């Protein structure tokens, strides 16, 4: 498994990014999710925000629900210095203050980088579209009639409506996995093909 380190920020609502998988991604300030797989460890900044753990600990219970005990969930304090966070991290050093990981306000306004598209070949050929971006990505756009592709900030997602066409649902996967290249995002972003009615527990944690 690759081990991720998330990066969780905000006042009003909270958004998610992956960071490198470093000490020196880390600040005071924030929230961190390092997910090594069947190891996930919430890493509290010495001044993070009560939303800012609050929606880390959600993220933390959707990947235990979906990984099915495979994964184990834990949350350190950052003067904990835990030292198996530090281990999986693969680094230790001194740690940003919340000062130098900027202004949780401004990432509010500034950082809203979850992206909603629909896959839908209804007019005889694949057309794949953005339908919204940042805080307008809504679970009432989602169409039983088509796929929809989300990129959370830290995932793609491929979620196959239950009445898609034979092509969207051949298709869906590929065009979420092409998404990743074109929007120039980190080659090893996860995607994942889920199927609606499904628990889909992190897909499903993105929109509360
Ligand atoms: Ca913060
Ligand atoms: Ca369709
Ligand atoms: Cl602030
Ligand atoms: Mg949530």
Same mark, same amino acid.
């Not at 958004?15 to 005071?28: A, F, G, I, M």
């Not at 999710?33 to 753990?53: F, H, P, R, S, Y």
């Not at 680094?91 to 949780?104: F, N, Q, R, T």
């Not at 005889?124 to 989602?142: D, H, I, P, Q, S």
């Given at each position: ?9 905000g006042k009003?609502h ?6 490198p ?10 929230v961190f999710?390092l997910d090594?797989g069947?190891?996930?460890i919430?890493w509290?900044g010495?001044?993070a925000?009560?939303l800012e753990?609050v929606? %880390?600990?959600?993220l933390?219970? !959707?990947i235990?629900g =979906?990984?099915e005990?495979?994964? @184990? ?6 003067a ?5 966070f530090?281990?999986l991290l693969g680094?230790k050093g001194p740690?940003?203050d919340?000062?130098?990981g900027?202004?949780?306000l401004?990432?509010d306004?500034?950082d809203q980088?979850?992206?909603l598209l629909?896959l ?8 794949f579209?953005?339908v919204?971006?940042?805080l307008?990505?809504?679970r009432?756009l989602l169409?039983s ?7 959370t900030?830290?995932e793609?997602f %491929?979620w196959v409506?239950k009445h !898609?066409?034979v092509g =969207?649902?051949?298709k869906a996967? @590929?065009?979420?996995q ?9 080659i090893h ?6 199927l609606?009615?499904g628990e ?5 944690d993105?929109?509360?």
């Amino acid at each position: 498994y690759r081990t991720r380190l998330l990066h969780l920020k905000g006042k009003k609502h909270i958004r998610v990014h992956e960071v490198p998988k470093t000490y020196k991604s880390l600040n005071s300030g924030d929230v961190f999710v390092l997910d090594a797989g069947k190891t996930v460890i919430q890493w509290n900044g010495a001044k993070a925000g009560l939303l800012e753990k609050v929606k %880390a600990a959600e993220l933390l219970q !959707a990947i235990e629900g =979906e990984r099915e005990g495979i994964a @184990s969930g834990r949350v350190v304090a950052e003067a904990d210095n835990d030292t198996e966070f530090f281990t999986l991290l693969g680094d230790k050093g001194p740690i940003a203050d919340a000062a130098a990981g900027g202004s949780d306000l401004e990432a509010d306004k500034k950082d809203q980088p979850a992206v909603l598209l629909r896959l839908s070949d209804a007019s005889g050929k694949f057309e794949f579209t953005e339908v919204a971006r940042g805080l307008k990505v809504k679970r009432n756009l989602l169409d039983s009639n088509d796929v929809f592709v989300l990129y959370t900030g830290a995932e793609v997602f %491929a979620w196959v409506g239950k009445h !898609a066409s034979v092509g =969207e649902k051949k298709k869906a996967l @590929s065009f979420a996995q092409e998404y990743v290249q074109k929007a120039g995002l980190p080659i090893h972003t996860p995607v994942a093909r889920i199927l609606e009615g499904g628990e889909n527990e992190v897909f499903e944690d993105f929109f509360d």
